[PDB]
Structures are given as structure tokens and as C-alpha cells.
């Protein structure tokens, strides 16, 4: 679990969005596993606007933060799950690191701000949905 709170927006994994997220929907994209909903309170987070490929992510299954080197956002094949059929997920960044399904929503940050959230994983892999291209989150 986990979300980004920026301005009057809440960014979550689309597969974990709540009834309230869908009732306050701003934008969603199944191909990215992202959903953004509106909030009444002002958020606590800053979004990075950069090309960093190193950062730190929070891993809830270890209660710890880990440093990572990650690939640039790209189209990556993701096997079928209870949430989605087998498909290519876009704007995904992979890295070597521990993750389990419940880790989705953990934030990845670089020195500039929030880069993205945990969205996929594998045997010693962790994948993050990028949010740096969503310029409208800042306005
Ligand atoms: C952090 S998610 C994760 C982490 C570890 C694993 N494991 C750990 C060992 C074997 C294995 O595959 C499996 C996942 N699940 C996973 O990637 N998905 C399920 C939720 C929806 C995701 C999507 N964006 O399509 C895909
Ligand atoms: Zn950065």
C-alpha cells in the first residue's frame, strides 16, 4: 500500500484504488497501473522533474529503505495477475531489489523529489511506475 499526496491530488496504484478514489477520479491509465484522485486537503509531497536513474525506495515487507539503480521508463511485459491480463505495462522502471505484492505503493525518491511508486516485482526485482512526466500534478 501507499500513495503520493501532491497539491490536491492523490496518486495510487490503479489496482489498489478505493471506491472513494474512483468517485473522485481525475485520471487513470491501466497500461501504467496508475490512478489519480482529487483531495480536499493539501498534500505533503514534491515531484522530481529530472532524469535520475538512482534513488531510494521504501520496502514495506522489510520495513526498510533500499538504494536502487533503475532503468529508464519503458514498455515491459508483465505476466497475468488477479488484477490484469498479461500485457505490456508502459512507463515502468526496473531495478534489482526485494519486493512482494503488498509492497506496491512504496515511494521511490531521488535528491529532487518523488520519482514514482512500486508497481511490479519478481525474483530479486522491483518495478516502479514513473510519475515524473505527469507535469499537471504540480498545477
Ligand atoms: C511489487 S508487485 C510483486 C512483487 C513480487 C512478486 N513476486 C515475488 C516472487 C515471485 C513474484 O513474482 C510479484 C509481484 N506482483 C506483481 O508484479 N504484480 C501483481 C500486482 C499488479 C502488478 C502490475 N502492475 O501489473 C503485477
Ligand atoms: Zn532526480
mmCIF file of C-alpha atoms and ligand atoms in Angstrom:
data_model
loop_
_atom_site.group_PDB
_atom_site.id
_atom_site.type_symbol
_atom_site.label_atom_id
_atom_site.label_comp_id
_atom_site.label_asym_id
_atom_site.label_seq_id
_atom_site.Cartn_x
_atom_site.Cartn_y
_atom_site.Cartn_z
ATOM 1 C CA UNK A 1 0.000 0.000 0.000
ATOM 2 C CA UNK A 2 0.960 3.659 -0.372
ATOM 3 C CA UNK A 3 0.154 6.926 -2.141
ATOM 4 C CA UNK A 4 1.747 10.230 -3.260
ATOM 5 C CA UNK A 5 -0.049 13.378 -1.989
ATOM 6 C CA UNK A 6 0.806 16.428 -4.137
ATOM 7 C CA UNK A 7 -1.357 19.566 -4.224
ATOM 8 C CA UNK A 8 -4.999 18.468 -4.378
ATOM 9 C CA UNK A 9 -4.112 15.066 -5.878
ATOM 10 C CA UNK A 10 -3.616 11.549 -4.510
ATOM 11 C CA UNK A 11 -1.602 9.141 -6.762
ATOM 12 C CA UNK A 12 -2.094 5.412 -6.146
ATOM 13 C CA UNK A 13 -1.585 2.066 -7.969
ATOM 14 C CA UNK A 14 -4.730 1.720 -10.132
ATOM 15 C CA UNK A 15 -5.129 -1.937 -8.945
ATOM 16 C CA UNK A 16 -5.328 -0.761 -5.288
ATOM 17 C CA UNK A 17 -7.622 2.292 -5.834
ATOM 18 C CA UNK A 18 -10.544 2.510 -3.394
ATOM 19 C CA UNK A 19 -14.268 3.277 -4.015
ATOM 20 C CA UNK A 20 -13.516 6.868 -2.887
ATOM 21 C CA UNK A 21 -10.599 7.171 -5.374
ATOM 22 C CA UNK A 22 -12.914 6.158 -8.241
ATOM 23 C CA UNK A 23 -15.673 8.554 -7.035
ATOM 24 C CA UNK A 24 -13.126 11.444 -7.080
ATOM 25 C CA UNK A 25 -11.347 10.326 -10.306
ATOM 26 C CA UNK A 26 -9.051 12.766 -12.117
ATOM 27 C CA UNK A 27 -7.179 10.390 -14.433
ATOM 28 C CA UNK A 28 -6.381 6.708 -14.726
ATOM 29 C CA UNK A 29 -4.335 4.519 -17.086
ATOM 30 C CA UNK A 30 -4.498 0.712 -16.872
ATOM 31 C CA UNK A 31 -1.402 0.426 -19.117
ATOM 32 C CA UNK A 32 0.623 2.350 -16.445
ATOM 33 C CA UNK A 33 -1.106 0.864 -13.304
ATOM 34 C CA UNK A 34 -1.803 4.476 -12.160
ATOM 35 C CA UNK A 35 -4.834 6.316 -10.849
ATOM 36 C CA UNK A 36 -5.056 9.926 -9.604
ATOM 37 C CA UNK A 37 -7.950 11.153 -7.475
ATOM 38 C CA UNK A 38 -8.796 14.605 -6.044
ATOM 39 C CA UNK A 39 -8.363 15.563 -2.365
ATOM 40 C CA UNK A 40 -9.749 18.363 -0.165
ATOM 41 C CA UNK A 41 -6.573 18.728 1.948
ATOM 42 C CA UNK A 42 -3.228 19.997 0.542
ATOM 43 C CA UNK A 43 -0.663 17.214 0.022
ATOM 44 C CA UNK A 44 2.720 16.667 1.735
ATOM 45 C CA UNK A 45 4.894 15.556 -1.332
ATOM 46 C CA UNK A 46 7.207 17.245 -4.195
ATOM 47 C CA UNK A 47 7.583 15.536 -7.650
ATOM 48 C CA UNK A 48 11.037 15.163 -9.191
ATOM 49 C CA UNK A 49 11.467 16.638 -12.724
ATOM 50 C CA UNK A 50 14.731 15.004 -13.755
ATOM 51 C CA UNK A 51 16.420 12.030 -15.472
ATOM 52 C CA UNK A 52 17.867 10.365 -12.332
ATOM 53 C CA UNK A 53 18.413 6.615 -12.597
ATOM 54 C CA UNK A 54 19.423 6.104 -8.913
ATOM 55 C CA UNK A 55 17.315 6.701 -5.799
ATOM 56 C CA UNK A 56 15.915 5.106 -2.649
ATOM 57 C CA UNK A 57 12.597 3.227 -2.246
ATOM 58 C CA UNK A 58 10.548 2.170 0.741
ATOM 59 C CA UNK A 59 10.003 -1.619 1.067
ATOM 60 C CA UNK A 60 7.095 -2.356 3.451
ATOM 61 C CA UNK A 61 7.841 -6.133 3.512
ATOM 62 C CA UNK A 62 11.194 -5.311 5.154
ATOM 63 C CA UNK A 63 10.172 -2.018 6.968
ATOM 64 C CA UNK A 64 13.301 -0.517 5.347
ATOM 65 C CA UNK A 65 14.506 1.805 2.634
ATOM 66 C CA UNK A 66 16.917 0.491 -0.029
ATOM 67 C CA UNK A 67 19.108 2.277 -2.613
ATOM 68 C CA UNK A 68 18.475 1.276 -6.295
ATOM 69 C CA UNK A 69 19.799 1.741 -9.828
ATOM 70 C CA UNK A 70 16.769 1.615 -12.199
ATOM 71 C CA UNK A 71 16.132 1.539 -15.931
ATOM 72 C CA UNK A 72 14.607 4.454 -17.842
ATOM 73 C CA UNK A 73 10.764 4.335 -18.118
ATOM 74 C CA UNK A 74 9.827 1.793 -20.787
ATOM 75 C CA UNK A 75 7.247 -0.764 -22.103
ATOM 76 C CA UNK A 76 7.788 -4.052 -20.212
ATOM 77 C CA UNK A 77 5.867 -7.315 -20.441
ATOM 78 C CA UNK A 78 4.058 -8.156 -17.171
ATOM 79 C CA UNK A 79 2.605 -11.644 -16.596
ATOM 80 C CA UNK A 80 -1.112 -12.046 -15.829
ATOM 81 C CA UNK A 81 -2.215 -11.461 -12.235
ATOM 82 C CA UNK A 82 -5.620 -11.350 -10.449
ATOM 83 C CA UNK A 83 -5.700 -7.618 -11.386
ATOM 84 C CA UNK A 84 -4.717 -7.596 -15.073
ATOM 85 C CA UNK A 85 -4.372 -9.890 -18.070
ATOM 86 C CA UNK A 86 -0.838 -10.498 -19.471
ATOM 87 C CA UNK A 87 0.134 -7.174 -21.106
ATOM 88 C CA UNK A 88 2.857 -4.573 -21.654
ATOM 89 C CA UNK A 89 2.935 -2.029 -18.850
ATOM 90 C CA UNK A 90 4.270 1.385 -20.017
ATOM 91 C CA UNK A 91 6.378 3.997 -18.120
ATOM 92 C CA UNK A 92 7.826 1.174 -15.939
ATOM 93 C CA UNK A 93 11.362 1.251 -14.463
ATOM 94 C CA UNK A 94 13.036 -1.971 -13.244
ATOM 95 C CA UNK A 95 15.667 -2.435 -10.608
ATOM 96 C CA UNK A 96 17.307 -5.198 -8.592
ATOM 97 C CA UNK A 97 15.837 -5.143 -5.081
ATOM 98 C CA UNK A 98 13.434 -7.042 -2.840
ATOM 99 C CA UNK A 99 9.679 -6.712 -3.293
ATOM 100 C CA UNK A 100 6.470 -8.672 -2.566
ATOM 101 C CA UNK A 101 2.919 -7.844 -3.935
ATOM 102 C CA UNK A 102 1.919 -5.822 -0.834
ATOM 103 C CA UNK A 103 4.909 -3.526 -1.425
ATOM 104 C CA UNK A 104 3.018 -1.720 -4.238
ATOM 105 C CA UNK A 105 2.614 1.962 -3.395
ATOM 106 C CA UNK A 106 6.043 2.369 -1.721
ATOM 107 C CA UNK A 107 7.658 5.623 -2.869
ATOM 108 C CA UNK A 108 10.873 5.819 -4.936
ATOM 109 C CA UNK A 109 12.684 9.194 -4.362
ATOM 110 C CA UNK A 110 15.856 10.796 -5.711
ATOM 111 C CA UNK A 111 17.514 14.052 -4.412
ATOM 112 C CA UNK A 112 14.916 16.061 -6.444
ATOM 113 C CA UNK A 113 11.689 14.592 -5.125
ATOM 114 C CA UNK A 114 9.303 11.726 -5.722
ATOM 115 C CA UNK A 115 10.106 9.677 -8.853
ATOM 116 C CA UNK A 116 7.393 7.002 -8.738
ATOM 117 C CA UNK A 117 5.759 4.145 -6.818
ATOM 118 C CA UNK A 118 6.354 0.364 -6.584
ATOM 119 C CA UNK A 119 4.081 -1.359 -9.123
ATOM 120 C CA UNK A 120 5.635 -4.748 -10.124
ATOM 121 C CA UNK A 121 8.274 -7.227 -8.890
ATOM 122 C CA UNK A 122 9.897 -10.581 -9.341
ATOM 123 C CA UNK A 123 12.669 -12.805 -8.010
ATOM 124 C CA UNK A 124 15.028 -10.107 -6.725
ATOM 125 C CA UNK A 125 13.368 -7.480 -8.945
ATOM 126 C CA UNK A 126 11.294 -4.401 -8.171
ATOM 127 C CA UNK A 127 9.449 -2.260 -10.783
ATOM 128 C CA UNK A 128 8.312 1.352 -10.333
ATOM 129 C CA UNK A 129 5.593 3.267 -12.164
ATOM 130 C CA UNK A 130 7.163 6.644 -13.149
ATOM 131 C CA UNK A 131 5.248 9.866 -12.381
ATOM 132 C CA UNK A 132 7.911 12.453 -13.468
ATOM 133 C CA UNK A 133 6.267 13.026 -16.842
ATOM 134 C CA UNK A 134 2.879 13.995 -15.287
ATOM 135 C CA UNK A 135 3.573 17.742 -15.318
ATOM 136 C CA UNK A 136 -0.008 18.620 -14.403
ATOM 137 C CA UNK A 137 0.443 17.149 -10.851
ATOM 138 C CA UNK A 138 2.260 20.474 -9.951
ATOM 139 C CA UNK A 139 -0.549 22.804 -11.028
HETATM 140 C C1 LIG B 1 5.628 -5.425 -6.032
HETATM 141 S S1 LIG B 1 4.497 -6.423 -7.016
HETATM 142 C C2 LIG B 1 5.235 -8.032 -6.974
HETATM 143 C C3 LIG B 1 6.400 -8.269 -6.253
HETATM 144 C C4 LIG B 1 6.948 -9.540 -6.199
HETATM 145 C C5 LIG B 1 6.347 -10.602 -6.857
HETATM 146 N N1 LIG B 1 6.981 -11.896 -6.834
HETATM 147 C C6 LIG B 1 7.928 -12.232 -5.752
HETATM 148 C C7 LIG B 1 8.354 -13.676 -6.065
HETATM 149 C C8 LIG B 1 7.592 -14.100 -7.325
HETATM 150 C C9 LIG B 1 6.959 -12.831 -7.845
HETATM 151 O O1 LIG B 1 6.568 -12.625 -8.987
HETATM 152 C C10 LIG B 1 5.179 -10.377 -7.587
HETATM 153 C C11 LIG B 1 4.612 -9.096 -7.651
HETATM 154 N N2 LIG B 1 3.390 -8.865 -8.330
HETATM 155 C C12 LIG B 1 3.299 -8.123 -9.465
HETATM 156 O O2 LIG B 1 4.292 -7.730 -10.050
HETATM 157 N N3 LIG B 1 2.025 -7.815 -9.891
HETATM 158 C C13 LIG B 1 0.783 -8.042 -9.133
HETATM 159 C C14 LIG B 1 0.016 -6.745 -8.897
HETATM 160 C C15 LIG B 1 -0.163 -5.968 -10.208
HETATM 161 C C16 LIG B 1 1.195 -5.724 -10.884
HETATM 162 C C17 LIG B 1 1.041 -4.950 -12.182
HETATM 163 N N4 LIG B 1 1.480 -3.692 -12.159
HETATM 164 O O3 LIG B 1 0.597 -5.493 -13.200
HETATM 165 C C18 LIG B 1 1.864 -7.081 -11.148
HETATM 166 ZN ZN1 LIG B 2 16.315 13.315 -9.629
#
